[PDB]
Ligand binder design. Structure first.
Ligand code: ADP
Ligand code: NA
Ligand code: NA
Lengths: 298, 289
């Protein structure tokens, strides 16, 4: 028998409005492919009831907290419903920038040189010893919470204020060597790597506000560089145990080498979002994209 | 007025019978400490209804699949009920022996030399090149799925193939590790306190105190705490460690919902630390908020 598919959308995260748009687009793409899909605004409907309500399969179009962080995936594993995108471990692990980095680093994959600091070290160390802890990174530096509170630090004297700000939001903090850019993103669909996209933010960070931002696809990279980036992205994604689909974010340094930033396990699916753009460049319609993502669940 | 606490127990995993015992003990320990606790056999009661039923707080005494692997923790996070033990990420990460190892290794923490192999490499490689892939590990070897089902001790290179075939029945990632001559220890952690280690001898024998010197116990306690924080654990858990012939410690794994029967490891360590079983479980619950 045919499957009843729930498209989970909206929710209660900061990204609710983007997720309503993603879910609305996904819903229309699936129906255009003949899939018996229904929109479910998880703000109003508890995801714990999906099986009771008769669903066989779930397409996840939520973003942020409660969507791409393992929680929802856990609920779905408890109900034993197949769902799109990565599983519990990978969905959660990809929210943790420290542990993401550690896994990549143990596998010899390139990440920006950095220093991790917990609250305990922050409380037992003088600024001066903090400066010495990060001296080997040079300048300038990025300071961020391991899971908002981000700063660019240009001079050693600015470090303290940045740490204080970052520890407001988290008990683990990362201090990274600044990378010149540019920034890229690489979408992955099943085992296929899609064409990369170069991203130019209006300011210093490709942050929430930036997500005036410019996107280029094709990225402008040479063919050799694209092949390198594709292979690297795939490794980065398999390293964190991702599956189904996702987006890998990457940055160049001044030397032209790539460095891994993060993997996003529930990407934006609006008409103007990154994955649909890359899919289009790859030769897929939006409807084909979403039907393919669904087919890769289970 | 008082918080209503659910002790989740039993369930449907292979470890159901051990979990009924753990839950029964926890339930009695919490009541003895003055907590309004109720036993909830998750085989018969769906965990998705805990809030509807009026519970405010959950003590998790399930083991194995659906208890200590992130899925239950996800349900509880969705319901927004405070619960005992580690969160989603840590509960799930600790079931992945490859990624556990990789995180520990990137932090410079000690683990046994090993090789990881996926299905693709297994399918592309002959028995002879497999042997050569692991030659640097010496003999004997432990072969295990990355996620003791499907585990073997391999004593001779010619036995490697059969062990890999068995292991790939259960997983697409397999670990081949250098065998360690022992002894084995386990270190219970409660909030930020490290409890006394227990030496485990493979009719199974447990020694607490472990027999280690004071300086070695301090080293082990610090190492265990780092291993636990490395994987983002909280609330409580058990870290398993082994020695090599020279006395160096190596991290094996972290367990995010340990056994709580009368004869289980964590209670034995708590007792040696000076806590009654009732105090132990009250402390664990207090760590949930
Ligand atoms: N080491 C770095 N050097 C330069 N820019 C960085 C660095 N790390 C992150 N960025 C910029 O900050 C943005 C956001 O940080 P990121 O680590 O991707 O996490 P989050 O998604 O939580 O903000 C990136 O997309 C990129 O523009
Ligand atoms: Na994620
Ligand atoms: Na676990």
């Amino acid at each position: 028998m045919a499957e009843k598919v729930a498209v989970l959308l909206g929710g209660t995260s900061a990204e609710r409005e983007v997720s309503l748009l993603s879910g609305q687009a996904v819903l229309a793409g699936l129906k255009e492919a003949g899939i018996d899909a229904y929109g479910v605004d998880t703000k109003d409907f508890p995801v714990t009831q999906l099986k009771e309500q008769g669903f066989d399969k779930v397409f996840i179009a939520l973003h942020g907290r409660g969507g791409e962080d393992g929680t929802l995936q856990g609920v779905l594993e408890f109900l034993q419903l197949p769902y799109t995108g990565s599983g519990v471990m990978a969905s959660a692990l990809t929210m943790d920038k420290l542990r993401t980095k550690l896994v990549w680093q143990a596998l010899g994959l390139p990440i920006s040189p950095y220093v991790a600091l917990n609250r305990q070290q922050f409380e037992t160390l003088s600024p001066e010893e903090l400066v010495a802890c990060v001296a080997k990174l040079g300048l300038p530096l990025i300071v961020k919470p391991s899971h908002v509170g981000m700063s660019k630090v240009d001079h050693a004297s600015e470090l303290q204020k940045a740490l204080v700000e970052a520890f407001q939001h988290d008990s683990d903090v990362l201090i990274e060597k600044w990378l010149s850019g540019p920034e890229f993103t690489v979408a992955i669909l099943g085992d296929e790597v899609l064409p990369s996209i170069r991203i130019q933010p209006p300011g210093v960070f490709y942050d929430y506000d930036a997500k005036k931002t410019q996107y280029f696809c094709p990225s402008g990279l040479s063919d050799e560089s694209e092949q390198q980036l594709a292979a690297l992205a795939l490794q980065a994604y398999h390293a964190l145990d991702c599956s189904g689909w996702g987006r890998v974010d990457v940055m160049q340094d001044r030397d032209g080498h790539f460095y891994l930033l993060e993997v996003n396990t529930s990407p934006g699916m609006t008409s103007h979002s990154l994955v649909p753009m890359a899919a289009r460049q790859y030769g897929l319609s939006f409807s084909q994209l979403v039907a393919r993502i669904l087919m890769l669940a289970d």
